[model samples]
Target: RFLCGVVEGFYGRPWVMEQRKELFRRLQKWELNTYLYAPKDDYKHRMFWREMYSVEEAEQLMTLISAAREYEIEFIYAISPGLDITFSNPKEVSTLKRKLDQVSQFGCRSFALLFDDIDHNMCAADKEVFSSFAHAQVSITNEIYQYLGEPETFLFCPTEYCGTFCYPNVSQSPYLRTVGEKLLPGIEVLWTGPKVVSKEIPVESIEEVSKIIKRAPVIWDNIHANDYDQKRLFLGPYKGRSTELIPRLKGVLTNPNCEFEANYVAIHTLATWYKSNMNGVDVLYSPQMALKLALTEWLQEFGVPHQFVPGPNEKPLYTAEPVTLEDLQLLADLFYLPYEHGPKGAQMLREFQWLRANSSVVSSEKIEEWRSRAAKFEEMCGLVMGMFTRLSNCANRTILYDMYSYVWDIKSIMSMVKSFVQWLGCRDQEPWAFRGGLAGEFQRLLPI
Candidate 1:
């Protein structure tokens, strides 16, 4: 079975139980089969890998596992112990088994061991018993895979997991060679593409990687990840990958934004991509079509108005306007992706640049055009502000709170741009005066 799904393998505050339960429902609905839990900040998951989860923690995990089982999705529990695990120590190995054994009792069958983002250096004891870092990781991973009764979906995430991280190059990298040749064949590997957050993952690149890994790898797609930049949110559809690669890969799991509510389009489009049956002559998947479908469903939640009461005894008379699909379309364009802007966003940028560049033209017709275009820019800005107001009133306060700050940040930026365009309409002061802020002044004080 193809293991398509999401990986909560980002660095941030982990999703709460309620959100995770909701995630299982969404995944089941989308026909995605897996969810790997490896939030980096989860103390027991990484920093304290040797420590056992308390009873309370165990109960919560059991509930989470039960929810996944109910939804018929794979709940793969992932651990990162490379931060301090003495790989050569028998005691540490036993502790690792014990932790997984505990989770196994909670009805989790799929498991993953992640060794990414850790220093390559090994402990003194590990050096004595192991030939290299890869040796230490493979030994531990294989031992655990066997100890767990050889589950069908065991995964291994290597330290040098991407093309850029391969020493010298992929084919010649001793680390990958060791992993491919020595690691257990049944244990699947997790890989990001050429980079950590790849802009494009070509099928040729996957074929090259599959040769060295000795098996088709599960893509740990990080295109939608936002943990690296707090100011960004990837609400865009999955693109830059072909449906032809789906058959070549073991699976593709997205490690998306920290905000769970903000991932509707990312996951939704991936489902669309997987369902797109590709033969040599078939048509291709469309990101725009997928995004439109996702937003249509997402709009349902936004349309349900939540009455806001200012005072304790206030009547439920204060309801915000309903959120429209157009409002969401504008909101999505503003926060689309890491590398590319959406159509509306790009249009707004192009208009603003044209307006500022031709601000000095003396022709009356040109001046009239500039003013009209400036109004158009401000009009787009006004729509964004309107979306913000409607979004704030969304009945699902959880989703609203998750997206509030990101929307507010973009709204503020649009407001600044609106003011700048307004100022440009009348040459009251030199543009240099507009650049008098402390940060702007410091930028001019230094030469690149």
Candidate 2:
């Protein structure tokens, strides 16, 4: 197992037991080998690490480990004990070991101790016992690994896990040097590339870190993470990482968009890149091709319903039409693309070649294209109405109404498209204005 995997290790809303359980299925298909359970808000996982899980809670988790193993996924239980751990206290070490030791009973062979995103200042007693803050962390980390009898897998998330966080700078940072030199060799360290959401990871940059970290780094890739910014969704395929570094790194784990459904492209494309990297292709790899191949396979299930379909055959079903929700998303992107011409109507006209062909002329085919796009836009809006309603009852109900404010922003999209369609009709004095659809009245479009 090369350790390609997903980590439910995010800041907000932990996945329900079902979601965590469901993830192993995807992991098997993608050839991903690990799952790190480290939700920041999971009360027992972080907030109350010292407290033992109730009998009911422990059973649900134990079953997950059993299920995840069936699919060849290493279900690792991760604990964030840094929030209040008294570093130098003997009692604190016992509590940490005690919690992990209990889970090991249920056959979880892999474990992680996360120290990221907490107050890094050491306890007053810690300063007296350890040489430095980093030394204290390494000591606790080494102790935990040994207590587990040097488990098959033990991962650590250092307090300074990103490039910028490396104090004073990367190469000269005393903190990184201490961890590299003092930290036990067998324990793997997690790094989130150069930035929280790194656009690109060059080999030279990673090579620089490897020199200080002693071993190849495990990338906690936040490339597709949208938790930091809710307004945008990264539906684009994974890019900016060279496949060449595949051999140089321990593995890559993605913490994608919080919305489960939104991760289809993120995870699939990464798998595609991994697949090719393993094939040992020696060219500029294209995730674009991989993405298209995946969509063709994935969207087959969302296909248009035929009347002859077996279930509920009496009533008509909305087939997964070619004009998909994703297609409409492409149309919506046009409205936000740096409105050209540097704030001038002429610039808009000059840059936009469609001013005349769109306004002055009429092609029945192009008209129909716009016609279909608008219909799909309204249809997508209607789809969202149904989607937002049932989301309340979904197993993964983390997608609450107000949490994703941008879902309601479709009104602005509809308004802009309508105005543009009307403007085109007026310029050529065409009958397109009369073609107003459900998008004209936003209130009426709302689901009851």
Candidate 3:
């Protein structure tokens, strides 16, 4: 089966067991094939990779693994030990092997060894044993793959995982060259295209990496990842690649938004993209249609009541106002993707920019038009504020809590923008009235 699914592999708090189980159901329903468990903040998964799980932790993990199996989704246990492991030491190798041995006992067959985001230099001990950083990781990964009885779906994430991380360039890098020629053939490599958060992953780039790696690379898609930025969240469709590329790779796994509830569009659109290309299906992929489909279903979950609470008159205290599809569409536009904003968001920016630029020349003829446009912008802001209120009163507190911080920030920013536009319409301010703080002063000093 093609590996299409989520990788809970962000550098943040690990999802709870219940969340993982929910993910399994979603993946199964979406027809995605696997889930890669590689949470970087999980000490047992990374910093403390050598330590064995306690009885309680083991039981929790066993339940998660079993839950994935129940949904027919492959559970891949990934460990990141590149921070401190001495790949040359025999005892260290044994400990690594032993750690995986423990997980294999939990009915997980698929596994991944992640070496991404670590230092480029090797330890002196490894320097003595191996020729390069690639060689060291490859040796350890191959040894572990053999020890795990050579599972059919082993994954390896190289330190130079993406194109920019490669020395010199992708095609000519010595590091990638070593990985391509010497890594075990059975083990599939993970790539993140040209950058960590790639705006677009061209087909030729994947072909180049595949040719170098000696096998088709499984993309570790970070298109929707928000771990690097606290104030940003992506709720956009899967885009920037053609369906033609589907036949060229081993698989594609999305490392999505840190907020679980915020990833509905990311995962849903990816599933739509995957299915559109498979089994002789003649469906043409469309981002607009995929997003509409996702929002239609997502709208249903916004009003799902949580635990019942009795009112003063014996009636339910909470009755959520149903969030409409338009609300979600607006929400998605406000925080669409990393590189580009959604259509509505882009239009908002364009209108705001023009209004700001043309404010200096407020002729009698243009004044009315200016006021009307500013009022129009205020209407957009009103919709966002209304959405925030409705989302706050949502029946599912789980979704609210997961999304509150981001929504609050966006609302606050919109409020500020509206204030600025309203103030601009009247033209009543000093030179530094807009931004008068120390940071603003510093920004004024720069000539860029």
Candidate 4:
């Protein structure tokens, strides 16, 4: 089987070795076959090619790597030679080569040649300079390949072709072709979704590139990564990213960007990609399965009540009612999106708006007062959830209508009507005065 896995970095700098054991367990649960030690803080200066480790640090890494091997998870040692070049500028070629050679002694079988996040303008200047730079890097990679006598085993990620956002100034056309030609001829090209958003690679683009390079491509999707605002791991596809690329690519690899939270959708998308390409399985039902798996895993991780009861028929029971505000909020955190934004966020906003209008009917004044009125809220939420389920089912069943229309239906009329009902109902507890009932009735269509 073709092995797949994630590149993960943990929090903090002192580098506790025991953390790797936990990381290994999580990887094994997901059936992920590899783990790249791509720690963010002090990783370049501390781990890669340096003998500056204390006795404790050395022991921890050795134990971690050995444990990883026990799990059959390949441990890849990645060296950020770019930092050595960009920040230190320590005698360019020789220093980089020496560092890489030193890393080989650690007994790691694979290495990632990362050229990520360097200044694009400098790297994209004159053709001669760029060519020379690529040539030197390729020569180093070739040296390492021959030194290990495992040319095909090493993976190359030339940040040259990363995406427009990361390396915007570099001309994508010449850069891709140049890296293909000048770098090792058969070296795999790592593509993140168009712009490195999600795993979705455009089919037309993949076909065009195969003709250009005469080689099938591998993808390096970046769905789970660091969030600048939260300063922690964020989940979900980057906005406008899709899983459509999964069906078209030769193979796919994921770089989690930061810590791995066992987010099921992201991993499911990957697993679905593998099953579709490798086993010829259809993925029409994978998204729901992924949600179930993710919820179960997250509960386990947090030591919460799993509460997940799969239907006796081995399918999800659609009658449990849609998730509530608390449920939606938790999922929002797990997916790493803003709590009040996005699709799930918008749904919660509507639900809360409904509750605000009916607050007067219940006898309490504090927010906790609403708990007693949950049945009232549940009644409306159930209706809304039923609408969503119907809309989703319709899209799955028919080809005539577009899914975007349903999305628009929720965001525009449904959200506004819910908001207005909450405002008016709180002023007066009379049901007839609420205008949302009519809109809700009109919006919902009975199942055929």
Candidate 5:
């Protein structure tokens, strides 16, 4: 079978209807064929198999799904049933089943039995008790599948293998084996990308699993997601490590962990690898080109300046720290270096060194303050679009080349734009507690 498309969990309930429309457009552009209804806080109650929506709210969601299908996207309905499955509470069990049935009736072709993200270790010692608990969940899923008369359409995601080889308890291992043995053979196992120790399942492990289960496992490679704890995106040296195992695997699925806002780049990369039968011309420039296309699209949507190759003298005002000469040199290495041991590697080393030196400066308290300051700056900058346009043009032009004229011209424009943004922030009379102090110190030292 051809590689199936993505399964994403969109966090945050505050994104407006228009934002959702834009997100769907991006998904279609990247050829993502599937979306999981994995909303965080506000939608969690609905996932508990409850109907918290009024007639209007329900209609709005239906409208969104219909529009999504028009773009050929498949929607998977998932509910967190494992946590609430108390066999003794017949009323609760019946309520959940009714909710699942309601969602399945609404043209949802797939479902996920989420047994992850709960406190499984709290009752680790009671093997028989949890086994019965797990079996009850499996039985309910089976009932739903049979009830729908389409068992093959359902995908099961149990927390069978999480957090290295250390099992939740001895009982946890037996529970998984029992579920695999007793449950419907058509059920699919979800594997998180190898980087997350709990979700990581090696090739050898996959091969071992094939002997026990008749159906092939589905790989949920999550390489593009960001760790909120670590401020940087994880575009590491081992970029395509997960896809390298695709040949040996039966079916593969990818989850781009964070920000549906930035799905274009990761999804494009996934599409290319999934269709390995296609010819390979050049992979190096494609990522950069894809990023550029995304940025252009975003600029157009926001009605901002859309210059892909700005002139040398144009500069954009920025409220954050100025991009120093050292920053430009590091970026130059990234552009000029080869994949193995070139300028990109040198850039990475320099970035690490800088982080090490200023590690203490990024404490939780400081970051929160910086974020609040950035939010205010963003609001102020949004009002004066003309000033931002000029500054942006200059910054973009500087990165394109290293000629003496281009470098000198862009640097001068950048300084002017940087100062202008600082001036704008001060003019707004907003709290500049984070970056404002630093900006003041810089002006104090400069020759007026």
Candidate 6:
């Protein structure tokens, strides 16, 4: 099996011990065996790298280490000293070793040093000693590997981490070649596919990276991450990468939603995909099937009851929040395209899925009920329109910027829902797909 686990490598608040233990339980069920601890904002991990872990922090780390042991998971303690580290200074090198050596004392067998998302350009001091920026990183990383007495698991993330950031390009880049050749053979590198939030990763791209890195690049999959967009949440399935490409890759570890609760569909389906044929040409088990199977389980995970009031026929799954312009943009995106992944896309579709299911099975005695539901739909439409008016105000212009198309498109869909709700009584017939012409109409409204 390849490396399949979680990277608590998001930008903001990290999960508590309980949440992480919950994650480890799920990972065991999914046969994922690695958990990389590299939360970006954690003080000791990034901002104050030289400082030793405090007692309380150390206790938390020990608890995490103990929890991983229960689930047979690899708890890789990762540190990001890239923000500020003197590559030439022995004190800094000693500090790095001491920090990791402490993790070793606590019984951690895995270690990683991340040099991503920092200034890649050589500082004056580093320039004096090392040939290039990659050379400086390679030097320190090689030295640290020796100091640690070669741990069982070691990983490194380079300055030129991905294709887009790879200066000039990945193929001809001098830095990539230097890191590829000079870095220790046992140490692995992390890559975030084509971009930071890549929609799709190609096999040819991975093959190219393999040749350059002299090893398969461990994919730091950030497909469902929302740390960059505070207004969004990705409930979509693990998609766009072919499982056939899994052979060419080193391993695929997901850097999922910052909110642990929102990651069920993202993580569960990836596990299902891993176990399935994964040929991307599945008849009985496509990614969609993976999502459909997981959604019933996924819906239950949202412990907060979002179901405000049910329609005349059946109860709904979740409630709509204030529906700000950003939320509107998210819904309008799925309402129109229905295929693309965006904020709340999967959860949004589930709402319509339940609605359509109710529509298909609605009975003859429920004509009056359907008519009553129309009134509720219209009332909801009014609320949506009212919110749009407020979102359009000058005071909210900062929030309103670039959201004109999305808000109106969604309002139109709400209009359609109101109109469709009333007519459902007349045609209590077949299961209607969300891919109907009404959705396509919203598609045209967005700028091509």
Query: In terms of TM-score, which candidate is strongest?
Result: 3
- lDDT value, residue 214 of candidate 3: 88
Pairs that clash in candidate 4: 200-245, 201-245, 357-422, 357-426
Q: Write the per-residue lDDT of candidate 4 for residues 348-392, one digit (tens) a residue.
A: 556566566656664435555555444455454445545445334
What lDDT score belongs to each candidate, Candidate 1 first?
0.88, 0.71, 0.88, 0.51, 0.48, 0.74
Query: Per-residue lDDT of 1-448 in model 3, one digit per residue for the tens?
Result: 5799999889888788888899899989888888999999988999899999999998988988999989999999999999999999999999999999899998889899999989988888889989999999999999999988899999999988888998898899988899999889999999988899888889899988888888989999999999987778999899886787788878899999998988889999999999998753154799889999998988888778647767778865444556678888999998999998999899889999988998986538787888888899999988888888888888878888999988887887788889889888776866533644676678698997
**Candidate 6 local lDDT, 79-173, one digit each (tens):** 99987898898898999999998878877888899998898776699899999989999899889887888876788998778889888888888
lDDT for model 1, please: 0.88
Model 3, position 291, has a per-residue lDDT of 92
Mark the regions of model 1 whose C-alpha exceeds 4 Å error after superposition.
278-281, 305-320, 428-448
Q: Sort by TM-score, best first: what order? A: 3, 1, 2, 6, 4, 5
Q: On residues 296-368, what C-alpha lDDT tens digit does candidate 2 reach at each position?
A: 5555433323135646646544432243444323322321211111122232333233433455454367676
Clashes of 6: 1
Q: Candidate 3 at residue 367, lDDT?
A: 79
TM-score of 6: 0.72
lDDT (tens digit, per residue) of candidate 1 on 1-448: 6889999999979999988999999999988888999999988999898889999999999999999999988999999999999999899999999999999998899899999999899979899999999999999999999999899999999999999999988788999999999999999999998889888889989988899989999999999999997678988889888888888888999999999999999998898888785333255798899889999998887655433456666654434477789988888888888889899999998998898889887336777787788888899888878888777777878788889889987877787888888888767975643744676678787997
Point out where model 2 deviates above 4 Å.
279-281, 303-414, 420-448
Whole-model alpha-carbon lDDT for candidate 5: 0.48
Runs in model 3 with CA error above 4 Å?
A: 280-283, 306-320, 428-448
Which ten-residue region of model 1 has the weakest summed lDDT? 275-284
Candidate 4 Cα errors over 4 Å, as ranges: 9-16, 45-55, 86-94, 121-133, 163-172, 211-214, 231-251, 257-265, 281-285, 304-344, 350-448
Candidate 5: count the clashes: 10
**Candidate 6: segments with Cα more than 4 A from true spot:** 277-285, 302-448
Per-prediction TM-score: 0.91, 0.76, 0.92, 0.62, 0.60, 0.72
Better of 3 and 6 by TM-score: 3
Answer with 2 or 5, whichever has the higher TM-score: 2
